[PDB]
Amino acid sequence: DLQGTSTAVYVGVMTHDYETVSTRDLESIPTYSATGVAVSVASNRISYFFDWHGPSMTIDTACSSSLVAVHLAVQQLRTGQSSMAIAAGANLILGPMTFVLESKLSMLSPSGRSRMW
Amino acid sequence: AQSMYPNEPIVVVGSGCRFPGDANTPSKLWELLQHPRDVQSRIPKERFDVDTFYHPDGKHHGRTNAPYAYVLQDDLGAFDAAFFNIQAGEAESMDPQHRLLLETVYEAVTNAGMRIQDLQGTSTAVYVGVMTHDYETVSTRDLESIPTYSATGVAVSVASNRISYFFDWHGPSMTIDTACSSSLVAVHLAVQQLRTGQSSMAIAAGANLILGPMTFVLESKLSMLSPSGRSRMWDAGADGYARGEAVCSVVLKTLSQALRDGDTIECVIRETGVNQDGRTTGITMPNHSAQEALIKATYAQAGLDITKAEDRCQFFEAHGTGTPAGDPQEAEAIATAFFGHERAPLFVGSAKTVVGHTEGTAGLAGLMKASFAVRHGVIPPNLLFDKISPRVAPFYKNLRIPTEATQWPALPPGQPRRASVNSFGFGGTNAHAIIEEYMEPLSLPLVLSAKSQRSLKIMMEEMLQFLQSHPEIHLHDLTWSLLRKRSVLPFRRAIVGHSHETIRRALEDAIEDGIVSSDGQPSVLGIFTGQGAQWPGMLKNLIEASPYVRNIVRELDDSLQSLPEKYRPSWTLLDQFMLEGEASNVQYATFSQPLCCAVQIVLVRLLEAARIRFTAVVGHSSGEIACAFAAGLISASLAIRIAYLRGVASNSPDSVTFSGDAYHSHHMLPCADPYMQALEECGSVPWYSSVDAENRQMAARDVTAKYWKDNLVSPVLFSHAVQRAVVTHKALDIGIEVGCHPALKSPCVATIKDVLSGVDLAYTGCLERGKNDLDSFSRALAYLWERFGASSFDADEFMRAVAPDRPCMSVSKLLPAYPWDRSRRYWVESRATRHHLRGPKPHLLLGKLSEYSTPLSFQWLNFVRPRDIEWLDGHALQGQTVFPAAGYIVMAMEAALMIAGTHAKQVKLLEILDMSIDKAVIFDDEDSLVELNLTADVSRNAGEAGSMTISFKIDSCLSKEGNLSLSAKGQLALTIEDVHHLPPPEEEHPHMNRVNINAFYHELGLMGYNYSKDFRRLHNMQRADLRASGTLDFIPLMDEGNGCPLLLHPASLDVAFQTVIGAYSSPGDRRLRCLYVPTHVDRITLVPSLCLATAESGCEKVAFNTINTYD
Amino acid sequence: ESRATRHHLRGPKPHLLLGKLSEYSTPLSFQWLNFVRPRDIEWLDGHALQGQTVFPAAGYIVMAMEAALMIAGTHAKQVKLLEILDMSIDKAVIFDDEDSLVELNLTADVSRNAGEA
C-alpha cells in the first residue's frame, strides 16, 4: 500500500559510532561501507526499501534530533505533500568514541544513571 | 507582484561562501563560475598525504582512487576564535566544518545587510547540511589526546547549534544530512520554517571538508569517486565524481519580510520540493522517475506549469556528478519533466564540474550558481564537458550543457529569469529548488568595527583598498551600509571625510594612528555654544552640500522676513558670510548672534533627524536661544527670529569669564529694553535653564519676553545648569557642544566631572574651529557611534531626512568580508593521527607504517588479498593461494630499506639471520583479506660501526574473527653507509643434467606446489651431485604508489628456493614425496645495490647456483 | 569487527604506565600506547627535575617489567624471575605542565620465547 507512495522519512541520529568503528581501520572496510554507515542513508535506505518518495532526512540536533525530525514530519504532513511520515530516531553504543568524547566534558553520569532533577 | 504565488516565495538576502579556487566570498565564487579554471588539485599534504592512500584500484583495501579534489586554498586550521568568544581548546575541538560555517554565516549576514545585534536574540532559524564529519573521525581516531570540548566541537548537530549559540538565535537549528542533497534539503526546511512565519530569518548552510581519507576510502570502495579527479558532467569520461571542499551559508527570509527589512536581494527561492528515490536498482542508483516526479511537484507547488515555457525554467543546475549511471538517470528525469509530451534547448549546468562535488553543500553550491546566474542573467559554463555521454545522448535532445558564459535565453516581458537547482545524495534523497531573479519594480561617518584591534586595522586597510578599487560606489550608500546594514563590534573606529578622496586620506590617517575604541544609549546632553565662539564661514560646507541644510536656510530666511519692518532685515549672513571660500570674519553682534543661532539650529535639527534624544542645557545668548529651540517647545523660526532681533559667565566651578569693558553688564542693560519690547511683537525635551537656577528651568515661563531679556542681562549660570542636568539624569551617556566648538569643552567637561565626582562622560563637538562643517559633523557622529554602537543614532532616518533623493542602497554585498584574524591555527593533529594522514608512501608488501612507529621501532600494517597483489596468485600450495615464504623475506628487506631511509642510511649489504616461518599464510580466495603486520625493532643501531641489527616479525591473521599470529620472524643485519660484498659465486658444477622446467613444475604440482605464472619464471636449470644451477628471471617489482622498485620480486626469490627442491628432486623421480615449505633460514644475504641495478637495467634474466646441503 | 578494531573495543585492561595495548599487537610483539600527563598519574608530580616534572627513569623500568608481566600472561606463563639487560635512557621525558600529554609507546618484541627452556 505504501510502496511507491510519497511517504516521508525523518530520522534523528546523534551518534554514528559504527562509521567511526567499522572505519577506524581503513583496511578491511567493506565495499558498501560508504552507504552502509553514511548518516543520511539511515533514512534514505528506509525509503529505498519501502519504495517511498517522500523526503528522507537524517536529522542530527544531538539529543533533540528525533523530536526535531518529528517536527519536520509534522510540517511535511501539514503541507499535504506526504500522506505519511516516519519520524524515527536511532542511538546505539557500538564504540567508545562517543563515550570518551562526552566524558571529556563530564556530560555522562559516572553513577551510570540519569537521576532526573 | 512576485509574492502572489501559492506559497510565499523565499528570497536569498545574503550569502557566504568558502569555495575552492580562492572563492572565499560570493563575488569570487561568481567570477569563478562564469570564468571557470582548473581549480582541482592534488590533495594538499597539510590535509592528508593522499599519496599515502592513493591506488589505481578504488576497491583496494584502505586506498582511494581519487587523489584529486576541489580543495580550499585556505588554511582551515586558522580561525578567528576571539571573534566568536571560543577558547583555544574548544576551537581545536571544533570541526573545521563548524568554524567555516560560522565564518560563512557571518559573511552572509554582513552581505545580507543584517547586524548581529539586530538578529541577536531573535527567532532566526538555522539548517546546516553536512554529509561528512571527517574531523570527528580524524581528531577522534586516537582516543588519547582528544581535547576536552571534542564532543561539542565535532558533534554534527553542533554545526548549526553553535551558529545559533554565537548569534544568540532562537530559531530551529538543524544539521541536516541527506548526503549530497543535505544542504538543499536544509534550504527546503528553512523555506518551510520561514513560510510558517515562526522565524524571521533562516540560515540554509552546508559544509563539506576533506580533512581525512575516511570518506575518500569509503566512497572509492564503491568507485563513486572519479579516478580522473574531476566530475565530468554527462561526459563520456564519466567515471564518478570529484570530492570538493566548500562551506556555503545562505540567508533566507520571506520575500515580504526581506522587502520590509530592506535587505539586498540575491534571488527568489520560489519553491523547494524534496523527494526520495524508491527501491532503485541499488541504494546509490538514482531513480529518473522519482526525480521527474520531484520536479513536476515542485513546479506545481510553485503555481508553475512544467509544459509551458513561460513557467518552465531556462536554466537547470543539475546534480551532474559525472557518475556513469546517475547522470543518464538525471538527464532522463529532466527531459521527461520538461519534455517528452510533444525550439530552443534548455540549459543545464552542474556547479559540481567547476567547484567539484562538495557533497553535503553540493546542493547549496548549485543553488549559489543558479542564484548568481539568475541575478546577473548569465548562464555559467561547465568546465569539464568535452563529449556528451552515450548514455545521456538519448535524453540530451532537448538539453544543452553550456561550455561558455552564455547569455540568458529570450524571456517574455514581465517574467523573471527562472533557474532550477537539483541535488541527489547517495541513497536517493533528491532536493529540487526553483529560483527566480527578483524583479525589483553631508556624508555619514565611515564606521568600521571588529572583535580585535588587529582585525579592525585590517578592516580599515581592506576598506581603503576596496575604495581604491571601487571609487564609483556612492559614499552615502557605503556609509549607511556600514552603519545600519553592518554589525557593530567591541573594537570600533569611524572615519571622517566629505568625499572618496577625503575618506581614503582619513583611512590612511586612522591606520597610522591605531587609536580605536573598545567595547541602547542614545541619550545626549545638548550643550550650546554662546556668542563670541563663532568661527568664519560656519555651515558653508553644510549649506553648499546638503539640500536639507539649504531648506533649513530657507526657513531661516522666512524667519528673517518675519521680523518687523522696524528691524527687518538683519542682513542675511546666510548668503553674505556662509559662503565657501570667502568666510569673512563674523564677530559683530548683528551677524555673530544670528549666525551662531542658525548654526546651532541646523546642528540640532540634523541631530534630531538622526533620532538623537536630548537633555538640553542653555549656554549664553545665541547658545541660550538655540537651546531653547532644542527643548521642542520653541519653533526653530522663533529662535532664529529672536537671534536676529537681539543682533541689533560661570562656565564651570573653576572657570568663569565675566565680560565687560559687553554682555551681562551695564553696557547691554539698557540696550535689551527695545529688544524685549520688540520680542513681545516679534515672537517635550528635558530643558534646564542657566539664566535662572532651577526656578525657571520650566516649560512655560521660558517663553516670556522677560526670560529672553534676562538671557543677555543675567550672569549665565551655565555651570549650575550643567550640574542640574547631569545630576538629575545620572544615566546620561554623552554631551555634545552644539554649535561652534570649542567654546565650552574644557569647562563643561570639568563641571560634569565635578558634579559626578571622578566620572568623565563623553564629549563631542559637531562644528570644529575653522574646520570643514561636513568633517566636524561626521566626526561627531563617529564619536557617538564609537561610544554607543548603532543605538547612538539612526542612520536610516538621517538619510531619510538628508538627501531623500537616491535612498541609500545596501551595498554590504560589495563591501569586503570581515578579515578573520587567522593568526593562530586551531587543529588536532595527534602525532599518531598525523602519521596516519601523512606518512610514507604505502609500500607494497608492507602497507602503511603504523602511526606509533619510531625510528627505532616499526610496524608496517597491511591486509594482503591476492587480487590486489597481481602476482600473488602464482604461489599456490595444495590449490590454496599461499603467501610465498620468500614474500616474508622480501617484506623484511623492504622494511630494512625503509628503516635505513628513516635514519638516512643506505644499505651496502643486507643480511638476514635465524629467520623462521612459524605459520604459512593461507588465502581462501583472491578477495580474502589477510592482515600482515611486519614489526621491526632495530636492536642495535650502530651506524657508527656501520651495522644495524633489526629483529623483525611478520604477524598474520587469516580472518577478522581470528587473533593476530606469527607467520615469520628473524633478524636483519645491515651493513650501511651514511648516504664484492658477497663471495663470488662458486664455479659451476662440471657435470649437470639439464632439467625440463615444464616437467619439473608438473612434478611439483603433483606433490602440491601449484606454482603459476610469475612464480615459475625459471628460464633453465640443471642438477647433479645434489647441486643445481641455471638461469632464473630476476623479474622486477615496483610499487606505483611508492614510485620506486623493490629489491626482490618474491617470485624470483621463491624460484631460487625452488632451485633447492630441483637439486633435491629431479623432474619425474618423485623424490619430493611430500610438500616442503620453508620454515627456517639460517641466513639470507642480499646486496641491494646489485638487485636494484639488475631490476632497473632490464636484465632480469640472471644466473643462480644452489647447494642442497641436507637431503 | 576488524581484528584491530575488535582489539580496540575489546582487549586487556588499560594497564597503568602503559595504557591500552596496540590493536596490532601479537603474542610475540607488543606496543602499549599511552599519553601520560602528571595529573592523571597522581604520583608523577613528585619526580621533578630542574622544576620540570620529569618521567622517572625508574618509570621506564616499571613499565618494562609490567610489559613483561603482560607478555607472560599472554602466553599464560608466570615470571619467577624478571631481569633487564643493557637498558638505556636515551631521552628523558619532560612534562611542561600537569595537564600536558606526553605519548609513551612501549614496544616489546620477545626475541626468544623459550618457555621450553
Residue numbers in the entry:
A (entry chain B): 119 to 235
B (entry chain A): 2 to 343, 353 to 451, 471 to 548, 555 to 683, 723 to 735, 761 to 782, 794 to 1089, 1100 to 1231
C (entry chain B): 939 to 1055
Q: What did the study's authors say about this model?
A:
The first isolable intermediate of the lovastatin biosynthetic pathway, dihydromonacolin L (DML), is constructed by the highly reducing iterative polyketide synthase (HR-iPKS) LovB, which partners with LovC, an enoyl reductase that acts in trans. In LovB, the β-ketoacyl synthase (KS), malonyl-acetyl transferase (MAT), dehydratase (DH), methyltransferase (CMeT), acyl carrier protein (ACP), and ketoreductase (KR) domains are active, except for the enoyl reductase (ER) domain. LovB terminates with a condensation (CON) domain commonly found in nonribosomal peptide synthetases. In DML biosynthesis by LovB, the initiation and elongation of the intermediate chain are carried out by the KS, MAT, and ACP domains. ß-Ketoacyl modification cycles are also repeated, but the tailoring domain usage during each iteration is highly programmed and permutative.
The structure of LovB adopts an X-shaped dimer architecture, and the LovBC complex reveals the position of LovC which binds to the MAT domain of LovB, forming two complete L-shaped catalytic chambers. The LovBC complex adopts an X shape in the front view with two wings. Starting from the lower region, the KS and MAT domains are connected by the linker domain (LD), with the separate ER (LovC) domain interacting with the MAT domain. LovB alone is ~176 Å wide, while the LovBC complex is ~294 Å wide. The chamber is chimeric, with the KS, and MAT domains coming from one chain, and the DH, CMeT, ψKR, ψER, and KR domains from another. The LovB–C interface is approximately 522 Å2, which is mainly contributed by several residues in the loop region of LovC and α helices of the MAT domain. At the same time, the MAT domain Mut1 abolished interaction with LovC. These observations suggest that the loop within LovC and the helix of MAT domain of LovB are essential for the formation of the LovBC complex. The significance of LovB–LovC binding for the integrity of the catalytic chamber was analyzed by an in vitro reaction assay catalyzed by LovB–LovC and LovG. Figure 4e shows that the interface mutation abolished the synthesis of DML acid, in spite of the full catalytic competence of the mutant.
